[PDB]
Symmetry: D2
Subunit: 249 residues, 4 copies
Amino acid sequence: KRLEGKVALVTGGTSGIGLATAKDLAAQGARVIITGRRQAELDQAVAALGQGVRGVRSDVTRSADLDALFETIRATEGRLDVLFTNAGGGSMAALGEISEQHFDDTFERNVKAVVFTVQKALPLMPQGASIILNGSIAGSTGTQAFSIYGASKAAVRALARSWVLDLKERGIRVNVVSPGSTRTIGLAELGGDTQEGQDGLLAYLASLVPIGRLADPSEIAKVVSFLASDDSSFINGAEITADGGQAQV
Amino acid sequence: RLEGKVALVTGGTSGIGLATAKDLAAQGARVIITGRRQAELDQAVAALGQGVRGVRSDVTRSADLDALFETIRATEGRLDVLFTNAGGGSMAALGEISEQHFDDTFERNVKAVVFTVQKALPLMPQGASIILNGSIAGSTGTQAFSIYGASKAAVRALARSWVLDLKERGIRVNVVSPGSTRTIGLAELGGDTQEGQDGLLAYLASLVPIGRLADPSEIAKVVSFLASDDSSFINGAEITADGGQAQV
Amino acid sequence: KRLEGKVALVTGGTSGIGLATAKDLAAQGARVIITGRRQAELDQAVAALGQGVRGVRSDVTRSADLDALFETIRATEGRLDVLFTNAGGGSMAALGEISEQHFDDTFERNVKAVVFTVQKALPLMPQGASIILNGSIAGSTGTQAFSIYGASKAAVRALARSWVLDLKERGIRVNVVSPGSTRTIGLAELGGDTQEGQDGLLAYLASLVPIGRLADPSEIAKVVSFLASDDSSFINGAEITADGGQAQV
Amino acid sequence: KRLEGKVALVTGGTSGIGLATAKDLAAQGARVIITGRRQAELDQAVAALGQGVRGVRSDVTRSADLDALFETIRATEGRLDVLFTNAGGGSMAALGEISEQHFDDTFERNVKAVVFTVQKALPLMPQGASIILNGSIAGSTGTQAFSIYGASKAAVRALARSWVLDLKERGIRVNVVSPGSTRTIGLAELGGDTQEGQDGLLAYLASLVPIGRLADPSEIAKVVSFLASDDSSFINGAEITADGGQAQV
């Protein structure tokens, strides 16, 4: 349909929003490449998705893994139309308890990997290709024990505005999807390892949403597909936020 | 995507409203367009075809609004989608602003938007989508356009509170803010000199970072996306298609 | 005494934030002129303010009242170094219950008055004069049944960004103060005639602020004095929010 | 005198905006401690400021330098009332030319050092202490070849919103100053080594400002002084932008 004939790569495709985005992009008819750190899970994701989804095992923090993955696309498909940098990390640390490792790992995966994934992608990307970055409402709001996560997402959003000018001659457009609270394994885990703890956190976050329900990952994926499509041609550097109104009110 | 959904676009005759109605019809929505002048409306509705229906209407009159929504109730009986595109723009610098240069602009951009939604609301079912006409001028500053820009900023603000008003309804309010889109109105500002319209459009085209005025179809696709159910989790948000002009 | 020797006009000086502001501009030594909804109250406020403050009561919705007040300042002082437009109205109406007059009143008073108060004021204001607009955090956020009030404030803030371009040859600078919840007769009356209604609302609103404390009107005034003072010389078109962090998180 | 009886620390105090802030903070009567990377430059600053300003050479990226410096504050002054994080780095790299070292250096100094500078300070800071972070308009806008610098400054602002909640029990308030273009050696150095190259660049940057003039460093400093002062008591998590209207338009 809309994405017919388009090659799309999603880093952090194995689970959650990346998995749902890969599903939705394939349904629209894109060839989808997804990246996972661990081979067994990546294979399970590729099998479940089907529909011409291809898995490459990679760590976005490792510079060499990025070169290999982009080499596979160039060998297999010959171009990259859509890039969604979904690979991300999050942990709770309040000020006064923040370790050097908690900062570095967060910024390495959430911010540093995004820059180098995008830089390496560009030679493959044609004029009119579309890039989507994984922002969060955490980038614009304040949450206790989430300062490092939110600052990394805010840094991600800003990258888009300056990159608009850098990519201008290329003709590639970069935009940001910022999800509100979305039902995913990662969100549930924050509630703890006990099922009753996961339910409690999920219920509390749902109350915070104005409409009162956590997002389904498919609802986030549709935003990326719209951004991936030619319909988004005039959009550049913009932030599209699906929060149920949480960040808007 | 829009098949089986009733959609009303005010200011349908030209520009984005014309482009928006065309796109919603292509997606399969029942489309009703509002026009100030019948000859423009009748010629517009004929060009659209595709089961497009045209009602003449002036938003600044409650009467014209009341009549139009009664027709929707009789014919379709529910509005799935609402786009308020009817808008006015004039240049007034501080020291040049008339009391009614303000009054006309804020009627049309803001007051007509408030009432159009209020009269539309009873027809709208649970899960319906409302899209408002924001502008990048609402978020930025341009010399002699304070009155236009301030009205659009009010347009954007309405959605945030209207999310809370409409929560029990299940209706969702979102704002589209276009950048410079080629339009008779964008040309109007250059003047009725052929060089004045052309010289202006090239100047605004230089202003956009990509270096091109939007085609109205590019703005239209955004409203349809908000119109579609894919936007189910979007509420109270502003989506801007400016080519990055407001983003940088 | 940074604002010593400066003439300042405050609309809505009689009550709440305008009264506290008038006190603070007077403390630095500015000449302060305040406006009154009604003579009785305006006389009481000037007596409370002392310190050579003069009150002219006029209605901002009326151009003639503006011309009269603007003539008195030029005759009495003949200069307007600092302008604070605090005169404003706020009422609660949910969508589906909003009257034609309620939108018209709120918008005429909060928005229409600002344009005309500022436009007529300008001949008195010298190069380097500072203007402050009355924004609110309600302008950037959404609260149930307050759509018309917030939209009006958003219109106020937008004016400043375009007005900097108009006023550049002027040398006048426009900046916006957006208060968070501040204890005022206007805030309390919202709870109701009953003290309980007033007390219950104030305690509930206090909880919403992250610091958990309702603002004193002087705390908003000190921000207005800072914008009024020469220290704010490089700030232009900006919005400064003293909200207790409410809109920030 | 308003900051009299307040202990203030400014990192990156030796030059430019940090130097001016130290001068203004000292003028209000705060005891001022400044940090410099280079001892010779730091000593000249400490000599010039006078008024009992104390200098500690320190590289904020090094955790040990931070521990040493705060140890001196606890031994000498015994508390820190005001903290302004001015230490910062800026370089130009366009997308497709961004090295890993250019990314790491910017984020270590602009973002990571800020987190740990603030974290180590907290035991010293009493209830009612004020923290100011160095935002930039680059965080809110996009400029070609400045994606990393802008992303780091955007992350700096985001920390404040979450730190509002983290520090609420502490009674400390966190706010961000975001300067527009300010005439400084670093802005000049960036345009060209040559003075002729610098004049055109400074003149060009001046044109971008709506008022049409680059800021003096003292104009930025007054905002930090206001934020340092008790007048900003209700402000929390807010960003104050002194750009001459550049980002506001």
